[PDB]
Amino acid sequence: KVSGNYNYLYRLFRKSKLKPFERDISTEIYQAGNKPCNGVAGFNCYFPL
Amino acid sequence: RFASVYAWNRKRISNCVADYSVLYNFAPFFAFKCYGVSPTKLNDLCFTN
């Protein structure tokens, strides 16, 4: 549709790359820096989905 | 004295080795939005220009 279903999303960032046939169900915030974010998801902290 | 959006200046960079891991301390760095190139995979990539 004009916006598309947001159910289907993909991950962007993780510390370690994938291994063959492993699922990665996890709702967190990737820490792109040395700032201990508590889930704000602002600067140096991004939502992977 | 940075330039305007309509009239910008290109700062060519060709004779040095560019690491971004320590330039974050020259400004508050409000935004770090960028593309599929990994933020941590910026100091190692050998860009042609």
CB-CB under 8 Å, A43 with B29: yes
Q: Going by DSSP bridges, is the β-strand pair A45-46/A30-31 parallel, antiparallel, or unpaired?
A: antiparallel
Cα–Cα distance between B9 and A47 in angstroms, integer? 33
Structure tokens at A39: 């889930």
Q: Is A32 close to B39, i.e. CB distance below 8 A?
A: yes
Task: Give the residues across from A31 on adjacent strands.
Answer: A45
Distance to chain A for B29, nearest Cα, Å: 8
Structure tokens at B25: 């301390």
Phi, psi of B26 (to 5 degrees): -100, 0
Alpha carbon distance, N-terminus to C-terminus of chain B = 25
Instruction: Using a CB–CB cutoff of 8 Å, tell me whether B30 touches chain A.
Output: yes
A43–B30: do the CB atoms touch at under 8 Å? yes
Separation of CA B25 from chain center: 13
Helix and strand numbers, DSSP H then E, in chain A: 0, 2
Calpha distance B10→A48 (Å, rounded): 32
> Which residues lie across from A46 on neighbouring strands?
A30
**Is some CB atom of chain A closer than 8 A to the CB atom of B31?**
yes
Region of residue B6 (left: phi > 0; alpha: psi -120 to 50; beta: else): alpha
